[model samples]
Target: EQPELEARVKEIIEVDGYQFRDLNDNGELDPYEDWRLPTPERVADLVGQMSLVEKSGLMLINTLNAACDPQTGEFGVLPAQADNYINTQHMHRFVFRNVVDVRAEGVECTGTGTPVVSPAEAATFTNAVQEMSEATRLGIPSLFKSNARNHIDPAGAFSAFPKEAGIAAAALGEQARRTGEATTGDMSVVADFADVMGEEWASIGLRGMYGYMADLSTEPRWYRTHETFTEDAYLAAEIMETLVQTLQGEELTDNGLALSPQTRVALTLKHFPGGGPQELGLDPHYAFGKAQVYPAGRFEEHFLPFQAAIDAGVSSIMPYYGVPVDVPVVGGEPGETYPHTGFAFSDSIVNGLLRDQLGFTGYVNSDTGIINDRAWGLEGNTVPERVAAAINGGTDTLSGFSDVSVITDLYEADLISEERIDLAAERLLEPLFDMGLFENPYVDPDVATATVGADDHRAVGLDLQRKSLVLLQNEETDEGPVLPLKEGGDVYILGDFTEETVESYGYEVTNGNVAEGEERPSAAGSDYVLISMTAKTNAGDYVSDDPSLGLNPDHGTNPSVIIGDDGEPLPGLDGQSLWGAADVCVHKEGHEENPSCTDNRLRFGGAYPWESSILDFTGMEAAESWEVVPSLETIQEVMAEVEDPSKVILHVYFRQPYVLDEESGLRDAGAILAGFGMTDTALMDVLTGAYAPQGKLPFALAGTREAIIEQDSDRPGYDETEDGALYPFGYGLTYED
Candidate 1:
């Protein structure tokens, strides 16, 4: 069987009756160019042909950003950027950062506020990049990688689906929740999202993804919740298998992985082997929060999904940026110990645990900035040594650092061996070969535009979003349940939505003029008031100030206490304004004694050792931004105008687990619904009973903020004790219930 060949700059050679690409342009069939050869033979042949520089570049996956000018509102892909990465660096794979969310008509969804490219434009940009890459000395095709692009963000460049959490909630219905144990939930829905989104990725010329996060949601206070499947390791394991099978196919072949013609994007189950257990819910993106402890001895709970992914033939695995500081010994000796290093640099974790213990057969992708920024435990080592350390530690490919010299300098100095480079380069090229990217490197621009965000794709998204809604509370009044809202009465919206949108669902919009941060609607004439609250643990809390620079008192001191109903901080609440009133001013007194902006401060991710201060951050808006939880503040503010308690329908857009009690203004609400990365249209369908609410909670809602500290980081988020959780894990309500 002859495979289709696409050669942009190279010539196609006819050998006997068959055709092959003359990749090296010698006018003969090279082993690497012959479509008939097994993927390993071609990969081995190509790696041998690559120079140290080419091999070095192949061992890295960096970003390719479009010059999306803010003022002109144009997303231009320049030749220099392409030339630097493809020609100078000799790189083949890249993290495509061009696809951003688009903002439409006064609605703020999840998007990087920038000019977005049309699907056609995105396809052309990638096509042109791939063309340059093909014209290189080796004629190897380019493969672009991306984060989860399939979520319900109106990114016009591709199709969107219900986010991972939404998919899990809807797919693994109430039965899975009620069982409350390891159960094989419906996994076809997870595959559906992957297949639908992979089609969009394939149409646009992207061949790899950095996702389908294998990490569990053990820590509710942790920033990322909606991005992955829930806390259940078994469920996540099943999801991982389905994702790899659906996207990359069931097995790797002599031809290459996912040897199919349709749009297929390979998945990388990430933050491996696990990343959920954080100390006090502190993210390891900062120096102080780098330690991950397994006090509960539940480390294997985290290992389940990754072990499953490895068995299913995952193309790659990106270890987390953080390191395991404390783990119980699994071997012969009772008090055994291991070296503490970031997951990317740990030999014990990556080599001993993943590659040796478990039978993982894919390339190891280092989390972004392993060497350049997050040199975690190997902080004392030199940069060149760190590169070799990760290489020696079994990292086949590194990410984020774009400079070719990072690897070239080390190899020239004999810091890293030639055989090591070949090993990594071979691992990197196999995926490209397995995916049949060498032949089908190019994609039709019309296919990208026509396939992405198609009506069918959008319908699938709406259907899932409707199913994923969690009805936490549906109180009965004299009238009835607040939901399945009565036939045709005036409806008031407290958050972002259109009157036309509500009316389309057969409800009259009473609060058309009501807006966020404005006068609250009286909602007197309205039969039911719809209140939307998007709860979040702001990431800015973890991003700290530079130790070298302290707070500028001249800028004015924040209130150390007494944060009356003004909705401003008690500075202690928001992580950004760690600086409170200091009349004596220890910072002014001297820098040594003050720990306000020191190395010990919590951080998310920043300039290597962190060089910026709260003052340097301009507005400190993230710090000063209204805290989402104790949401009592925001809910009470909005509910002030609503008179009837029975008519209140509270909808929370949950990014992470939240605590909602009577004090959080639940007393005035009749119904509470939750969504993860949803659309307004989907909410309307549920409100009108077009699709009855059936989605279960992905993670437990903390009974109180204190419960955030009470629970151990290593254990699951379920707290069965009295008041441990407002709602336990797998808790949900259906219209029938």
Candidate 2:
């Protein structure tokens, strides 16, 4: 079969007495035909060589399941389906890790371990994909892309690094660089391993990365907060610039950005124009949460990190799925509003602003499934119409899709020209060629397995994990500070960490519970009590579409439920207030009696549910109920029964800074530690003074939900006058300092 394919299906033509794959099958030397030429020349040469059908296919990247056929080394739900996307559609790029959430913990869900692949398996699957594409008439290689799967997902069999929130807490550019190096180093290591295992990682086609989300966490409720850097634009920009440079390199080239073997990833600084300021902190993944507004007129603030990313020579960019709604121009005509369209569809945002003003020469990718003929700005448009509009809007790659006919039909209708299609194809192909994919796109599976999660890489990741711990509050007790706890003492452990793990740190650990109907985690008979609270860990699904939760802040009217004279919400209401009735019951900070009702309600939604309840409520369906987080009542109930509440140590794992007021009972704890997306071991190490805490608060920790809502969505960290945060940005404590 191999000989038959070589003789009948493929051919190698000689150019200057040298062998070259006849990619276009023209039987002559084309400008793009020579690899020795500069990347730009090669890009233009290749652009000139491909047909409209091929060019259109290059713009589409469809999902490819990581699951593989063990015997044949083929990947997909069905093995032969692999050939359809690449060979039939002529698609040159594919997305891996198609199922389940990428950021969830390893213990959260299960699938046949498909999302987590061994280095050898990933290499094998990638090679099979490349082989399928290479067998085509053009012999073009494919690019395999993954999200933050490298450092975030432990299941990926790749060395995991501290999440972005943790890395930001370190507040060290070197840590960011180290993270970038680890990410890219693992990538190259996989490539080397793949090659030694008889395949090239390049050949396996694992060349592209989906993130390094440069968006600052300006909006606290944004679901992607755990993945963001800091709320400070300058700090976020510094970290992002360093990270992208580490993933990619400092140099820009004619073939997009240049890449060496050391820097293997093509970082796509995501959700261009900054996705951190979604209206009401709602996500853009669903149609209900699609509008991203800028009430503060600080749109330029969100773009600062991206500007730094562009300066760092990022390889590509991804526009978010959310549409800009009534957002004022950053530095343009007064009262001017951006087009009410998704970033991918707005020619003004993508082409005019990003390309013309900012000069981002990299690929502009559309967030997945926007062109699925859905209703939004481009609703009712045909597939071909959307595809044509996206291309005209400066989109070079259509993520989460693979249909060449959508573009070919446009050509048939004379709606899109071949020349227009070639421009997009050039942008898409330049990265692959410049990355040396055309020369050697193969990896060794054995080497990949050995290289991905090597001992040295894990060591660096552990060090980063420890360094990222942020100690926010360490109060002076009657005796002294509570931290730097004595080793080998009896300790009551609460929350996620295991006794054996804490014992490994030389502390006798006893498991305890702080929630109702469970035994109280008492400090009696124990040297110290440790209580861990993860930011919104017990919180449930986001409520996006309710009318009560969708209004803008400037309206002055609260989005919360209006209390009738009877003190209950008006019956048969405008969709039970997104943040339930219990929050409505809480007394307003300013008015204890005859509460202005305004205080209880949110301009966009109700007072932060957890804040209103004055406790972390739970055991209720989240969409219907605002199951408060860290129910202050629950914590107090447990503490009241404890022998000495002062001995209780509060350790919090937060995605965004939370407002800790008197009712939170957290202030009553002897000491407080704040960690952003941390591991138990990292936290324990900090508690034992093994690793002194150095992380600073990424954003202002508001004391009340009202302050969080009242603050501008686009502005950086700020101190609030009423119901302000307990800790300001850049606040952290250490055992020594």
Candidate 3:
């Protein structure tokens, strides 16, 4: 089939009634520019022609911000920077932050790291980047990638889906299991989710996904559970297989596309070897939390999902920043000892295990900023040495750095041979070549904009949201079932909804959280009182190498650097004070009271013990990182005013399982709805039985903080015979017909 071609800097060559992009501006079609050539042959031909500098550039992906319009305050790919990356650096890959919108869906995005823009503006930026690529010697198309963008991000502009855990929750629900879809991965559901989200993404010229984390959520205390599928290995694996195929399809509109680089967005399964067994639920991004230990001998269980992803032909894999401190080879040679280093820097884990043992032919991309920051085990090593360790260990492309010197310098010094670079470059280039990006790398800005939150897309998203809401409780009220409450009934809303908007559903409403001076109206006369609750998160000081800083006294802090008020390392007094200056620390001017500064918490050299997570790094305080125990004093208070305690409907959005015991006051509520990242509107739809709830809990809930910390870090959280337990895994409810 002939692909649509868009050319700006290069001319289109017509040959035998089929047109090809003269990407290299060579007047005639080069082998790489010819769509008819086999992708492998084309990649080989292109690899042979690439200079070392160009190959080095292909292996590095840096952050690229959208250029801002002075008049409209909108953003797109910055033209000048695009030129430098494509022409000067010879780089064609970038990680995009912030986002775009069709109707600018979700909540009005704020602090998105960049100004908000329309989908067409984002597409125009991508096209411009491609145009710059066409002007280059080889015309390598720019590949733009991002993290999981479909979740209900407060600052996100894309069409939103329920959280990933919600997707997994649907698999465990009785309905799915009854239909035999749970064990099979529920392709219909997962495929539709991926296709809709993927279509929106590909429409805007973003062709890479850095997410759909294949890691297990074994530890309930683990802060990133919401992003993972589930704690069960089999379930997580099945979901990964379907997710990979759907997101990285041969075409955007089709499913079951061959497991190779395709026209749709390519998926990268992250934190290889699994990062679920975090010690004490603290992240390895800090030295104090750098150790990923498996105390329950479940180390090998984590690999099941990764193996499924490899089988499904994932385009790339990324290793987490944690050091595999004492990993045992449960599935390998009995006597083999896994290396005690970060996955990206460990040759045994990355090359021997992931490449040779698992036979993953796809490229390996390191997690962002290993060289610059969290080179955990190899801290203090020179940049070139660190680059060599990552590449030789089987990492193909480096993240976080646009400068190719460390990689090229290794080649120049003969510390790393050119053959290794060729092998890596070939793997990296094959996807771009096969995706047909070279043939035509442009997208329709108008169509792309229209597709953003388009009606069809929005409807499908709402469907998933309804299916994934787990009805945790539905008790009897004196008037009938607590749920599917009679229309036009009086109730009090204590959350984000206003009294008037919720009344649109035909109910007499009074919002409970009133102005401080005025008292909330009593729910004594009302049939129900609805309450919404979310867990609180906390952040504090960071880890440090210097014992004087009163932080991480662990063995791993290196580079011993302190961040300045500007958020960069103050300076090196390498030969003098351990930290450049006494005041140069994570609590400095720019870092203090700034949630954005906590991103620096991922860098191990800082002098603060900041609690960081890939999810919701809003810096909750000093005591709790991602608190699973939400305060339920309101439930207790509201229950007092309601005629029947069971009439108080409690809806909790579980980013991770909350520690709910009798002390949590949930027993006083009549009904409970467990929501993921679904919008409040979707929550209300299910609350009123506009759609019956169908999801099951993806992980079990602990009744207390002790239950979580005392449980095995690698084991599933559910245990009927265990103490401090609330609900068992797969726990949920539905209204009787």
Candidate 4:
């Protein structure tokens, strides 16, 4: 009854051609270029140029890999992470796949003659050489995109960067800015290369900085724990905002460095409204993961970071596949499907609230495989229905490459009108034009190979390594400060069990199999602690229920071992064994104290990979290994009878921030320090007190796990309950006057 009537009532979001540009090339980007400046006239002008079908294409996210059929404009699905399996049968339509058959579709493909570069190849570039090639083919200009590269996943050409957690812990504000610059620079270079090769546009897909992305909050055992900078959203927000500030390029003083050419690279902050902080880490890609049930009071807590990002003027926001029923959205029940037919693709909240209300003018991309995931029960998707919902919800781009023809079907169904499609298309073009891709579309191919993996760029990463080391705790209690161990005291270096302690939660790094001298991970001269007893393994011998436990040394396995305390056969402890020898015997057995029994001394039977003269404690059993527990009485007698237990400088390796909590009354020894992990560099620094410990606890560490879980959210863990965390946040005894 009223087609044009609907279009006239809505507002469109598009970028003003030169608004965000530093036309004079003065280096500093002006906020005037921001689309959020409320220049509705600019949007209207761009909206004036497109047909209804092209406009609808903007709302649909067609993937480049497995697209919908071009000929039928129907549900003929692509098998690449296929959505038809769910979309057609599940009644959750609109989950279009990518255009794996780009050539067969008969459209002018920007992929012409260009070798499809893997993510790895593209990441290697830091200059514009590669990007120029991509620009030439598309002639529409280009932008590139990326995902987090923990250590180079299936993505080819990914740069082996340190974990995001590691980067965040470095704590140097300037260093973080530099890392952003370098990272963004590489991404831009790769996109340029892809553009020259025939494709255009690129983005760095960084999402975990936001809280709504989580499955469960603060479960340190989750493998993805290292993904977030910290559990507290405030800190994460600060980091997210700072990252944007660095990438967007603020005013540099006369003395400060100017914005680099790579600064033009667009950023895509993702998995919005949140992806982590979920229930048991259920990924929506799986069938059971329907709702991302955020705990009480966590939804608003998570929104803070994204809000900050919008204020900072990030270029793009990529929503995750899973929706938050608890999260508040415009004109809907808390539990309704997000970006629904009435909301997601064209809703006021998505465009109006996110764009108009929150002042966000960047592109909002939908998560991939929606057509299948929503419609097809097999892939957790349904097609046309979900696709239409995505369009109405406000998605601006189609990730599915082959699904281009779906626009016609959607228009015929009247689910989307022609004007809506044009509005989205204009918005996409706005960013592309602002990037100067429309005008300066060229990059050198040779520059791609030369600038990538360059020494200068990597050197920046090396410096970042040093800054990321956070000093958790450093103290020397013995008079005359026995530590930074003096003149050959009987230093007992322990074995694998304790030495192999892994950070239950925290970032991890790997040096590319580059063969180098492999400097001893320890910088301590061995003169520091005379009787250094490193517990290689738990002698109490506990076997593992996990069959794949010993898959690899790096995949969480004890690398060293040491002997037991007493003369008994505490056999059967296969995984937990301390090996190696020192001045005295030390063992990091599976059992801290036999939890099966009560006594401390009589239960002193365990095994080790070798005989040890040192016992490096890996804090708590749960935090250290997933294995056995020996009796506390047995361990007490083993150390008490050691000629001079006072001389046994206890090296506490705190894998979890609250590793030592749980015990009622654990013994305090000669010196106490927190070793975040057994890094080759950090280990030596802790032993020597290189820099006085300055790191405050990021979270409360209780004496026990029970105390932490039960405490009020507002109260600190120590105050609310005393289950047993040894040190509180910011806990560390440093050099005293």
Query: In lDDT terms, which candidate is top?
Result: 3
Mind giving the per-residue lDDT tens digits that candidate 1 earns over 1-737? 78888777988889879988888888888888876887788888898788889888988788885444444554545434678888888888888776543436643223454345667667777888888887988888888888877777414445556678788887777345455432456776677677778788888787788987988888655556557688878878888888888887875654333334432877777988788876554455644445566767788889889888787777888989766754654442576554566787777777778877776767899888878556665544677788889988889888886777878888888888889898888888887877777876888978887888888887777777777788888988886677788788878776656678888878778653444567654666667778776543233332234222334433333221222123442223223333322211232222223334322223443221121122111112233332443244444654565666678888876666655643545645889887765677778878878778888877777655556656777777646334577776567876763
- The CA lDDT of each predicted structure is 0.68, 0.62, 0.70, 0.37
Prediction RMSDs, each to the true structure: 7.8, 9.5, 6.6, 17.6
Per-prediction TM-score, please?
0.85, 0.80, 0.86, 0.54
Models ranked on TM-score: 3, 1, 2, 4
Q: Can you tell me which runs of candidate 1 are displaced by over 4 Å?
A: 68-76, 100-115, 174-182, 254-263, 329-334, 512-518, 537-626, 629-634, 637-641, 720-722
lDDT of 1 at 498: 65
lDDT of 4 at 160: 31
Candidate 3 lDDT, 526-583, residue by residue in tens:
7778877666553333323235442333322323332322344322211133321222
* Best-fitting candidate, scored by TM-score: 3
RMSD of model 3 against the true structure: 6.6
Off by over 4 Å in 2: 1-19, 24-29, 70-80, 98-115, 151-155, 172-205, 260-263, 328-336, 373-375, 513-523, 535-634
lDDT of 4 at 51: 44
lDDT tens readout by residue for model 4, 443-561: 43344444434455444443343333343333344455544433323243322222222221121211111224653232132222212222222424322222232122223422211
